[PDB]
Design a protein around this ligand. Structure first.
Ligand code: BMF
Length: 139
């Protein structure tokens, strides 16, 4: 089972940018708002955004060394990318807990991103067809 190439992983992370999110999951809140860094660290002490995820994809961090590429199921495959997607969503829903519309946007992105990763895993690993999907597990 050959892992996906770094170019394919970069193309996968690039496909997670949606026009309807208007860069909400791409912006680096620390670089964009220097005068609010410390408040964002209190709420989201672990940083995550699609710029960091694209660097990780490009460098082989999701598909090299001890990264889990193919697991027992689609859901349990590309675990490092799934954890990064989950942190991105957790940070957004925690920060926006009082703004329901922006929580719903983060949940919409979560479902969308795990489905994009599920379909990508299936394109590279037909032997995982029919197993648990990340879109069924992550919520
Ligand atoms: C100081 C002003 O701050 C903000 O405007 N903040 C945020 C704004 C938006 C936002 C804007 C425009 C649109 C069209 C949407 N999409 S929708 C209708 O689905 O909600 C969302 N999202 N957002 C998210 C996530 N997290 N923070 C923000």
């Amino acid at each position: 089972a050959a892992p996906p190439s770094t170019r394919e992983m970069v193309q996968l992370v690039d496909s997670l940018n949606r026009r309807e999110d208007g860069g909400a999951f791409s912006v680096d809140v620390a670089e964009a708002y220097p005068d609010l860094r410390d408040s964002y660290r209190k709420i989201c002490p672990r940083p995550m955004n699609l710029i960091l995820m694209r660097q990780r994809a490009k460098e082989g961090y999701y598909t090299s060394g001890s990264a889990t590429v193919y697991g027992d199921t689609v859901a349990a495959s590309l675990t490092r990318l799934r954890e990064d997607i989950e942190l991105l969503v957790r940070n957004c829903i925690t920060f926006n807990v009082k703004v329901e519309s922006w929580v719903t946007l983060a949940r919409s992105f979560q479902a969308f991103a795990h489905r994009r990763v599920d379909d990508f895993v299936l394109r590279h690993a037909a032997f995982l067809r029919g197993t648990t999907m990340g879109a069924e597990v992550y919520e």
